[PDB]
Amino acid sequence: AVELNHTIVHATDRDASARFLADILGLAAPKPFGPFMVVQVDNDVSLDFMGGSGPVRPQHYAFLVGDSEFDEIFGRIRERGLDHWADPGHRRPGEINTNDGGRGVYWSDPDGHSLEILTRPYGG
Amino acid sequence: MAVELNHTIVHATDRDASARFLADILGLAAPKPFGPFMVVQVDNDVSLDFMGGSGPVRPQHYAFLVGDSEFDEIFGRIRERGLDHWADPGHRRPGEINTNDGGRGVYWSDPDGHSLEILTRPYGG
Ligand SMILES: [Fe+2]
Ligand SMILES: [Fe+2]
């Protein structure tokens, strides 16, 4: 009976970064809550975007998506012209990985947060 | 929607001590090594990958929804370790809990200063 419920994502432009993630992932538009702009995903966790007082240090947020959703999100990445890579080290641009019997790709948010989607989880 | 948060990296100086600290206090299974990370798993299919070698860590915030009984057990372990704790994210109200959303909640800090929090009733859901 222990779940991760939310975490804060620091941003330069709080509203733009929240809209960016929700748009690319195909989620509902974010909602204001306290000082945050909240992006909700399906396993009962939300990402609370907060505006930046200081240097934004990039974090890593990876999402398990359906096979069809993978194609749609990948299409939006190319549609916006976002650089992307097969690997967390960004040594293989313009490729996807096929780790763990699934498919996965990495890209960056407006502040350089490392974003990643995958279709089959490690282990599970 | 078919979109879930699957994992995120938790930066630490001492990867293993930070991982053991979170799993022990939260009452989770012992962490597992995965590449350079020590992974802590929670029940809604998200894993927290702790990585070592981050100098001064930039504090992040991780809040956990727990059952009513688990709240008492996790709060009991916080008190038993003698950890400072607060009702509010601003750490202005020490040694008390909040009752946000009709529930119960408390804040504390991990070995590197990450803002940790448990709550029993979420807004909306
Ligand atoms: Fe990842
Ligand atoms: Fe919180």
Per-position DSSP letters for A46-94, written without gaps between them: EEEEEE-SSPPPP-EEEEEE-HHHHHHHHHHHHHTT--EESSTT--SBT
* Mutual angle of helices B15-26 and B68-80, in 10-degree steps: 130
Q: CA A110, A46, B113: angle at the middle one, nearest 5? A: 80
**Alpha-carbon distance B90 to A108, whole Å?**
30
Decide: residue B2, CB within 10 A, 0-12 exposed, 13-18 middle, 19+ buried: middle
* Å from CA of B88 to ligand 2 middle: 9
Decide: residue B44, CB within 10 A, 0-12 exposed, 13-18 middle, 19+ buried: middle
Do A97 and A40 meet the contact criterion of CB atoms below 8 Å apart? no
Sign of CA dihedral B57, B59, B61, B66: positive
Structural tokens at position B56: 């001064």
The H or E element that residue B78 is part of is helix B68-80
The reply to whether residue A2 touches residue B70, judged by beta carbons under 8 angstroms, is yes
* Å from CA of B90 to ligand 1 middle: 30
Q: Which of B10, B8, B28 is nearest to B113 (CA)?
A: B10
* Mutual angle of helices A67-79 and A14-25, in 10-degree steps: 130
Instruction: Indicate the domain borders of chain B.
Output: 1-125
Structural tokens at position B74: 């996790």
Q: Which of B117, B115, B87, B93 is nearest to B10 (CA)?
A: B115
Is B33 an interface residue toward A (CB < 8 Å)? no
Strand A114-118 to A60-65 pairing: parallel
The reply to whether residue B66 touches residue A2, judged by beta carbons under 8 angstroms, is yes
Strand A45-51 to A60-65 pairing: unpaired
Is A124 an interface residue toward B (CB < 8 Å)? yes
